[PDB]
Amino acid sequence: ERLTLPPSEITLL
Amino acid sequence: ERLTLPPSEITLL
Amino acid sequence: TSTLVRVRKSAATLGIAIEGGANTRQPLPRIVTIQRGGSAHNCGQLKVGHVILEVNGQTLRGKEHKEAARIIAEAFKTKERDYIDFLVTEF
Amino acid sequence: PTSTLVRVRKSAATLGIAIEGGANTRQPLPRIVTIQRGGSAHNCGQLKVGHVILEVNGQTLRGKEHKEAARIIAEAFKTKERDYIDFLVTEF
């Protein structure tokens, strides 16, 4: 099972 | 007029 | 719990920083910065912390970050009208 | 949006979760971002990465800063008053 979630990506719009 | 939110802290418990 | 917010294209840019997308810590795009002078800032109904669920009726649920950003950018780039509609939530 | 009450038995010497978030930051409520293999949370099976912790033993975490939310969880894990921690979690 998934035991970690990575930091989210970011975008300037 | 809060224009940004700071990154959250991460803690291992 | 979810609110429709119409953002008028009052400036050349949308002026928001978004964080989030499927399979990451923040699963849906969340507005983390609103740039002074951009369209979002002029709106007044968009806030930092708002999570974007839909853009012009197009769901962002389950989309990876880059795809969600592309969809928002494409919606803002419209020349047929002078606004963009977001379905947002706060918690 | 579903809220689930998950009882985590203190089956191991550590809780074994990393939490991110708290009031006035980008993630406003503590979200489980890592579950360490071998810890109490991993043995539970009902806790998942991505779960947002709303309450710990009936004590709300809504509006609490990260440091205070972490203190409440750490105290709940340490206390010998009970051999479990009830977390109210959500997954939106």
Side-chain angles (χ1 to χ4, degrees), chain D residues 7-12 15 39-41 43-44 77 83-85:
Chain D
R7 177 159 291 175
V8 180
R9 293 277 170 203
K10 294 182 188 173
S11 56
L15 180 53
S40 295
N43 293 342
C44 174
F77 190 71
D83 52 356
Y84 58 90
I85 303 171

Side-chain angles (χ1 to χ4, degrees), chain D residues 2-92:
Chain D
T2 171
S3 291
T4 304
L5 189 61
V6 174
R7 177 159 291 175
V8 180
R9 293 277 170 203
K10 294 182 188 173
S11 56
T14 60
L15 180 53
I17 63 171
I19 54 159
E20 180 195 24
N24 308 308
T25 73
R26 292 173 191 167
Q27 171 54 43
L29 288 160
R31 186 189 302 275
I32 299 176
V33 303
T34 302
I35 289 173
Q36 315 197 112
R37 229 181 254 284
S40 295
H42 183 67
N43 293 342
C44 174
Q46 289 155 256
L47 272 185
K48 307 186 295 189
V49 292
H51 267 151
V52 169
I53 307 170
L54 300 177
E55 293 185 8
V56 175
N57 293 335
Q59 180 168 17
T60 186
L61 301 184
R62 292 181 152 274
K64 310 247 169 124
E65 297 243 336
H66 181 81
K67 180 189 180 170
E68 180 59 11
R71 188 200 64 81
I72 290 166
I73 298 163
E75 173 196 314
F77 190 71
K78 193 163 171 43
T79 191
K80 299 165 187 152
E81 293 200 13
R82 59 189 82 78
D83 52 356
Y84 58 90
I85 303 171
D86 286 345
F87 290 105
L88 181 65
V89 299
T90 184
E91 201 190 5
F92 15 57

Side-chain angles (χ1 to χ4, degrees), chain C residues 31-62:
Chain C
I31 301 176
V32 303
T33 301
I34 285 176
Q35 310 184 282
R36 226 173 248 286
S39 296
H41 184 250
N42 294 338
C43 174
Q45 290 155 254
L46 272 187
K47 307 185 296 190
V48 291
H50 266 149
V51 169
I52 307 169
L53 300 178
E54 293 183 18
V55 60
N56 290 343
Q58 309 162 259
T59 187
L60 300 184
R61 292 183 201 79

Side-chain angles (χ1 to χ4, degrees), chain C residues 46-84:
Chain C
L46 272 187
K47 307 185 296 190
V48 291
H50 266 149
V51 169
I52 307 169
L53 300 178
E54 293 183 18
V55 60
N56 290 343
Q58 309 162 259
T59 187
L60 300 184
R61 292 183 201 79
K63 311 248 173 213
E64 297 242 337
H65 179 82
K66 296 321 288 132
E67 181 58 10
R70 188 198 65 80
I71 291 167
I72 296 164
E74 172 195 313
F76 182 79
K77 197 179 174 303
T78 187
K79 298 171 184 190
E80 285 135 283
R81 65 202 55 84
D82 56 348
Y83 57 88
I84 180 173

